[PDB]
């Protein structure tokens, strides 16, 4: 049970993220059931696109999606599906979808995992093309799913990124 | 425990299949133990062949193999090992092996996973080469395993494919 | 030399396409120099997208924009970069570029290369999602390259594709 | 829980090994937590190196690392992460590290998994370059991790390789 | 040009092989044009099989069937398509085709390319399963291509392989 | 022909590099013949290491050791072997070989190829770990090839890299 994994070692700036879809992976949406812990294939993406970064969730949280809080982690090389990355939140990606709103945070590995992003304090420190690529992926990856839309709102800093994790931690209590 | 996963949402025409070997994967037979849920490597295949499609089993079933009922699912791109696909059975592949008989069903993803096979009602709707390739794989993939043989019998439709799942559901009760 | 290859053994029904970019490949736009026949790295794609079919051109052809005839070849597996596929046109995709009007043909392999695409004689015989991914790919793969933009106009039948081949072979060396 | 898996079927010469890092894999150290069973990313390796073989551990053991006994298995093709290989120990690789000593055994699949190494009785039967490559990997793969060193001591045979498993079996009792 | 390459620095012990199909590659039969030196897509394989060694030919040789000498080069890792391996023959595989009689040599890389195959001087020094996969691959990889069929006759020693090289170099340009 | 390509559109700021070995590729050292322009397999690497950047040379240049100018091109994704990257030098790596003194330039792609490396104007603008992996790779990738050894001397600025380009173009065809 992935519930055994804490939301981190020192939340907010130390979250664990269980990866469901690796970066640059096959065009397949995976989602982890929270009763069997198995990797469920949600949909074979219609668009000819791939995820710009690893995307998963923080364990033992709850937002207004009904499901835990979604995270996108940037790594030097994609991680295996079902893996847990000790990362640090550095931004929040707000956007409106068919069923209300959705909010993704962008994350980055920790001191002991990788020195690559010691200078990444907030999402603006990542390369501009990546941020532009992350926005472009979510706006268009569901363009062939009938009835489903996505519109990108704006970005928010790490301090508010590290805020929504604070509120999702006890919303699961 | 994969036993938490039901055999489906609306059996017969809505089975779940836990994939043990992805399509076009490395020449390695994986099998999921049903006590630890871990992915066990059964044998490194002697033949220079790969699985024509993802092959796994429906959870919480039982046939006359002693183990659950085996399924081959056709997907636009191979799924990760240990994943569960919400698919629909569309055929049955009968064949005789060293220890009696074995029966595989061919399956196909569902409305909400992929529109690719909305027109696939039975195995004859899949391309002929695939069916010919699935038969050729099982007939020859054990040609270098000493003492083991496989002979291909015939094909059966979805209605009888959806029959053996009916009988394997309660044979596990 | 590359232009030591005819446009087709029996054009326009039988044509050759040198492949410049493979399908499902890394997002690297390759274009083949004709002074040198070396593979030139033209663009590292900004958008998180991949080519839905192997992209290339017909040897010994000259289109309007000054270069040979663009062809997307649909194959069972992605072919190597710089390899020659013997194929047959089945449709034509029309668009307007930043430089004016553009057009990409779509083709399936020759009968002797694969039996998978024989009853595919028009582009509408191809899967409906594949046609939509080609439309979606070309409409958005330049979204993050500045100065470029693509507007999808509409498809034309297999007979017009063979006509544009005839006209491209016409004005060339 | 991987604890359900025995240390083998007939220890010593029949150990099970849960693979955490596949061979020739991405430069990523994985480690399996022994409370959640999840695949944890330990560190993104600084060196431009890959693991010469699959490396994991024997379940339900304990050495003087505090963690179970580490094993390197040689296979015809890399196994998926989180898989369990029925292998046979054929050597011991002693070496001193920043925190005391570490000891790895080299292993090899069994009769029923692969005939490739029926003649491999001890690590000297494997190709010399592999042994030289295994030594070179561990000596240098942490050259960019600050504060961490590794020095290679020597090799020991299967009989002593099959000894340390004997002592790690009951050290977990 | 490709035929600007000798059959070997010191034939028949030292030979060159241009590789047409890599090992463990996608099931695409490539053959290299000699008018053009471009890589031609000859066949999308029907059978779910892959080449057990990199397939190619010796430059500046002419066999009976009208084409250069077929050689399978066993390498630690699959080499790129269209690349030149400096290798040494160790055996000969004999068969009868639909067009008559055929023969494929098997070779291991030159000493300066790898120390892994030095004490391999006959094909029986290669692993016994590898010899059987080459026999099984050629006997079945054309099972689904109509009009073709291959019958394995038997192997011949390393000395006959060097003799066929001498005779192939003999009648050529 | 390959030497039908200039050293650069506007050397030394704009240069071309034919890539001989891609990044993160299989440990196969390729070198491009100039008699033939075919890709020659030079060495199957003994050490379990991979190239940290795509390795190649500048056309129409002549260095001291008799061959064109070595350049490592850092790219978002590894480019195909034998492809031409339009790039800009940002630093120089100096070393002493078994044959004397050696030097490898490091380069980032031209502005028109990617916006990711524009504010990279010196090699110290590249990530500090990447600089260390190139130093570590060249210092150890020949550890298991006998007769060879590499000693890292130190880096030099982007202005010296443009100077060595000028001198390499100078004494050449």
Author numbering:
A (entry chain E), B (entry chain E), C (entry chain A), D (entry chain E), E (entry chain A), F (entry chain A): 1 to 173
Paper text:
However, because PPi is stable under normal conditions, inorganic pyrophosphatase (PPase) has evolved to specifically hydrolysis the molecule. Here, we solved four crystal structures of a family I type PPase from a strain of the pathogen Acinetobacter baumannii. Family I PPases are hexamers formed by two stacks of trimers.
In the enzyme assay, K30R lost the ability to hydrolyze PPi. The side chain of Arg30 also affects the position of Arg44. This suggests that Lys30 also plays a role in PPi binding. In contrast, K30R and K143R lost almost all the activity, demonstrating that Lys30 and Lys143 play key roles in AbPPase hydrolyzing activity. We also found that a highly conserved lysine residue (K30) in the AbPPase catalytic center is phosphorylated during PPi hydrolysis, and mutation of this lysine abolishes catalytic activity, suggesting that phosphorylated K30 is a catalytic intermediate.
